[PDB]
């Protein structure tokens, strides 16, 4: 998200983060965005939720299409540029890059893809820039009459119009099955010497907490008296019993 660079216009780039712990409210708690759209869930309330992975479409656009790239939308994209699953499960956040995607004097790279004859399956990546043909005769690898580029230019300037304005765009459809990344766990300090209804290292129960003289094994978390009834708790963390 704080990522400096997103993909080119025609090359929406997929990114995943997994096999770690993510704090999702701080990502929600940034307010630096002209776009914060989460569907199915809020940008918050994911810290108690663990997911296997999420895929982020990365690219550089103009502000007019901060709307145009999203599931459930219809238009030139849904027919000619980009189709997304009808059962999208995720979120779309984006933030403006109006002064941030054009280079001084004009980035002498600027080219732009909107349209392309082809067709799009849900969540499909297309980059082709070929001259558009509606059928009169083979172009024979030649542009000109009835062989015309289906991709107007945005043409980004530092003073880009709002429709023209570059925006940092992230399209998130969440993948879950073996979830890896949730909030931190929530959690508190470590306190002792009081009869408490506890959550011990995810083990929910009750009792008075006091220091243990018992010798636990390095992985050993808990001990249960006969009948499988807890007897001591290892600090999950400082591994102190």
């Amino acid at each position: 998200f704080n990522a400096t660079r997103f993909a080119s216009v025609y090359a929406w780039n997929r990114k995943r983060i997994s096999n770690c712990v993510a704090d999702y409210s701080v990502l929600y708690n940034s307010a630096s965005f002209s776009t914060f759209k989460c569907y199915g869930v809020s940008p918050t309330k994911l810290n108690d939720l663990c997911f296997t992975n999420v895929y982020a479409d990365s690219f550089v656009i103009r502000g007019d299409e901060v709307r145009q790239i999203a599931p459930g939308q219809t238009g030139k994209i849904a027919d000619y540029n980009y189709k997304l699953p009808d059962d999208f499960t995720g979120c779309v956040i984006a933030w403006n890059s109006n002064n941030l995607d054009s280079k001084v004097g004009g980035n002498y790279n600027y080219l732009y893809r909107l349209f392309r004859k082809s067709n799009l399956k849900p969540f499909e990546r297309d980059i082709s820039t070929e001259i558009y043909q509606a059928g009169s005769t083979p172009c024979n690898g030649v542009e000109g009459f009835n062989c015309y580029f289906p991709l107007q230019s945005y043409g980004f300037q530092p003073t880009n119009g709002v429709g023209y304005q570059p925006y940092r765009v992230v399209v998130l459809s969440f993948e879950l099955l073996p979830a890896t990344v949730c909030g931190p766990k929530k959690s508190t300090n470590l306190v002792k010497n009081k009869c408490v209804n506890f959550n011990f290292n995810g083990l929910t129960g009750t009792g008075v907490l006091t220091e243990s003289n018992k010798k636990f094994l390095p992985f050993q978390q808990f001990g249960r008296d006969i009948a499988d009834t807890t007897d001591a708790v290892r600090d999950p963390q400082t591994l102190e019993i």
Partner: nanobody
């Protein structure tokens, strides 16, 4: 308008190196993408390499590693350094310059320079 002129083509034995030069003239501020196209005899035009203003570059799998595309902003020229040339590389190479304002095509094309690699 923008003017593209190619130079540096010629005949080279297989395994040699060639550097093609494309000098842009006119309204340079309008040019956006610069890349090299080649059209081997009997084949269609293909994108060999393209470079972004920021410096981002991409190459076709056939030429990747052997060919490098760079720019000289002061010279207003883009170069195609061809190393370890193969007879397959023989074709007419076109410098292509995109126009910024326009449907971002390769609005400007060069005359094209023929590079022949002997075996």
């Amino acid at each position: 308008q923008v003017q593209l002129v190619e130079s540096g083509g010629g005949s080279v034995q297989a395994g040699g190196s060639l550097r093609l030069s494309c000098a842009a003239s006119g309204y340079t501020y309008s040019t956006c993408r610069k890349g090299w196209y080649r059209q081997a005899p009997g084949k269609e035009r293909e994108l060999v390499a393209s470079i972004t203003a920021d410096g981002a570059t991409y190459y076709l799998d056939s030429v990747k590693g052997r060919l490098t595309i760079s720019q000289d902003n002061a010279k207003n020229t883009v170069y195609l350094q061809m190393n370890s040339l193969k007879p397959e590389d023989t074709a007419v190479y076109y410098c292509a310059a995109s126009v910024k304002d326009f449907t971002c095509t390769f609005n400007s094309w060069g005359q094209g320079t023929q590079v022949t690699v002997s075996s």
